Design an enzyme around this catalytic site. Sequence first.
Site, PDB file in Angstrom:
ATOM      1  N   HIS A 248      11.253  -3.679   3.614  1.00 26.65           N
ATOM      2  CA  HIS A 248      10.910  -4.759   4.584  1.00 26.65           C
ATOM      3  C   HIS A 248      12.206  -5.462   4.818  1.00 26.65           C
ATOM      4  O   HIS A 248      12.786  -5.970   3.978  1.00 26.65           O
ATOM      5  CB  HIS A 248       9.623  -5.591   3.920  1.00 26.65           C
ATOM      6  CG  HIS A 248       8.406  -5.151   3.646  1.00 26.65           C
ATOM      7  ND1 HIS A 248       7.410  -4.527   4.169  1.00 26.65           N
ATOM      8  CD2 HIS A 248       8.186  -4.420   2.015  1.00 26.65           C
ATOM      9  CE1 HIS A 248       6.538  -4.108   3.512  1.00 26.65           C
ATOM     10  NE2 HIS A 248       7.181  -3.755   2.364  1.00 26.65           N
TER      11      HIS A 248
ATOM     12  N   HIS B 280      10.667  -2.000  -1.960  1.00 28.98           N
ATOM     13  CA  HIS B 280       9.487  -1.661  -2.874  1.00 28.98           C
ATOM     14  C   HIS B 280       9.470  -0.260  -3.417  1.00 28.98           C
ATOM     15  O   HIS B 280       9.351   0.854  -2.425  1.00 28.98           O
ATOM     16  CB  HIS B 280       8.135  -1.997  -1.885  1.00 28.98           C
ATOM     17  CG  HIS B 280       8.286  -3.438  -1.724  1.00 28.98           C
ATOM     18  ND1 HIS B 280       7.277  -3.933  -0.562  1.00 28.98           N
ATOM     19  CD2 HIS B 280       8.534  -4.636  -2.195  1.00 28.98           C
ATOM     20  CE1 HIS B 280       7.270  -5.274  -0.650  1.00 28.98           C
ATOM     21  NE2 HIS B 280       7.910  -5.638  -1.801  1.00 28.98           N
TER      22      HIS B 280
ATOM     23  N   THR C  52       0.978  -5.024   0.430  1.00 28.92           N
ATOM     24  CA  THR C  52       1.270  -6.424   1.415  1.00 28.92           C
ATOM     25  C   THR C  52       0.987  -5.818   2.729  1.00 28.92           C
ATOM     26  O   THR C  52       1.093  -6.479   3.541  1.00 28.92           O
ATOM     27  CB  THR C  52       2.910  -6.683   1.436  1.00 28.92           C
ATOM     28  OG1 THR C  52       3.564  -5.521   1.748  1.00 28.92           O
ATOM     29  CG2 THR C  52       3.243  -7.104  -0.252  1.00 28.92           C
ATOM     30  N   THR C  53       0.605  -4.529   2.992  1.00 30.44           N
ATOM     31  CA  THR C  53       0.112  -4.046   4.223  1.00 30.44           C
ATOM     32  C   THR C  53      -1.234  -3.492   4.027  1.00 30.44           C
ATOM     33  O   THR C  53      -1.520  -3.160   3.212  1.00 30.44           O
ATOM     34  CB  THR C  53       1.124  -2.691   4.761  1.00 30.44           C
ATOM     35  OG1 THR C  53       0.886  -1.745   3.639  1.00 30.44           O
ATOM     36  CG2 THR C  53       2.610  -3.071   4.575  1.00 30.44           C
TER      37      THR C  53
HETATM   38  N1  O59 Z   1       4.393  -3.166   0.470  1.00 28.17           N
HETATM   39  S1  O59 Z   1       3.453  -2.539  -0.549  1.00 28.17           S
HETATM   40  O1  O59 Z   1       4.340  -1.741  -1.424  1.00 28.17           O
HETATM   41  O2  O59 Z   1       2.649  -3.486  -1.195  1.00 28.17           O
HETATM   42  O3  O59 Z   1       2.476  -1.407  -0.118  1.00 28.17           O
HETATM   43  C1  O59 Z   1       3.016  -0.434   1.221  1.00 28.17           C
HETATM   44  C2  O59 Z   1       1.876   0.645   1.236  1.00 28.17           C
HETATM   45  C3  O59 Z   1       1.785   1.576   0.307  1.00 28.17           C
HETATM   46  C4  O59 Z   1       0.533   2.737   0.656  1.00 28.17           C
HETATM   47  C5  O59 Z   1      -0.671   2.178   0.586  1.00 28.17           C
HETATM   48  C6  O59 Z   1      -1.755   3.170   1.259  1.00 28.17           C
HETATM   49  C7  O59 Z   1      -3.040   2.988   1.099  1.00 28.17           C
HETATM   50  C8  O59 Z   1      -4.027   4.115   1.303  1.00 28.17           C
HETATM   51  O4  O59 Z   1      -4.009   5.011   0.104  1.00 28.17           O
HETATM   52  S2  O59 Z   1      -4.968   6.322   0.016  1.00 28.17           S
HETATM   53  N2  O59 Z   1      -4.959   6.895   1.374  1.00 28.17           N
HETATM   54  O5  O59 Z   1      -6.268   5.569   0.039  1.00 28.17           O
HETATM   55  O6  O59 Z   1      -4.516   7.027  -1.247  1.00 28.17           O
HETATM   56 ZN    ZN Z   2       6.346  -2.932   0.878  1.00 28.67          ZN
END
Ligand code: O59
Ligand code: ZN
Length: 258
Positions: free
Chosen positions: A94, A117, A196-197
């Site tokens: 980020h 991350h 965070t997303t």
């Molecule tokens: N910024 S962070 O590290 O907190 O997160 C980033 C997104 C990480 C991926 C999240 C995907 C969520 C969908 O998952 S599923 N299809 O159900 O397996």
């Molecule tokens: Zn992240």
Amino acid sequence: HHWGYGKHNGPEHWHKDFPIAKGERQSPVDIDTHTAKYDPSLKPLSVSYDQATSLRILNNGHAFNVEFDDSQDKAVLKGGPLDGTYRLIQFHFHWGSLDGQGSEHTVDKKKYAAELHLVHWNTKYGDFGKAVQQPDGLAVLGIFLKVGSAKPGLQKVVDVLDSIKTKGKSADFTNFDPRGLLPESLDYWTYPGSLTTPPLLECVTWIVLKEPISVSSEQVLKFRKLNFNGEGEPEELMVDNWRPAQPLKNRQIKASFK
Ligand SMILES: NS(=O)(=O)OCCCCCCCCOS(N)(=O)=O
Ligand SMILES: [Zn+2]
Ligand SMILES: [Cl-]
């Protein structure tokens, strides 16, 4: 339309499609160093990335993900506040449009230029999908980036960004060693949080390292050349893809050091 970081689809809009955005354990958060308390119950943190197998790098329209083969226990994170083994699945960053902002977590309100991350899922749940349906399904190792001397281990990532400039583009990215992105010290702060997303799922045990890594202005400038848009569309520079600090609520941040 889809969520993003613009004025019309940014963090302040997410709650409309992802109500958990106003939940009880949302991330990131400001880490007030004086309020954080050393926790003697924390076990030594173990980052074992020796057998890490990277596969591909992808521009997903929000950031870029360096994906790993998580079909076998290779790259794992254990110890610290963690119960069991967490397997590395991908890492991303980020960052901001300027060096004065970009990180999601802040330290005593200080914002770093960027934040790395490294995402891991609890192997007791079988797969990432099942893990994100559990309160302790994920563990994200967060590392702050400040602008100064270049980070040698990051250059290979920087030099491949030209091939994945736009949303949807991916490129083979094998044999990348994530150990080259770690700072010297593993001192950290930890607290229960969320992604965070969107979907902003509250399944994450956050482990944020105190020591930031230094990257050069040239390296972060190349991050800022990526695009949020897809190929053939007007250019929207991929910058400021960070969510601001969220209410701490009923949580305490613990420190691994005294
Ligand atoms: N910024 S962070 O590290 O907190 O997160 C980033 C997104 C990480 C991926 C999240 C995907 C969520 C969908 O998952 S599923 N299809 O159900 O397996
Ligand atoms: Zn992240
Ligand atoms: Cl914009």
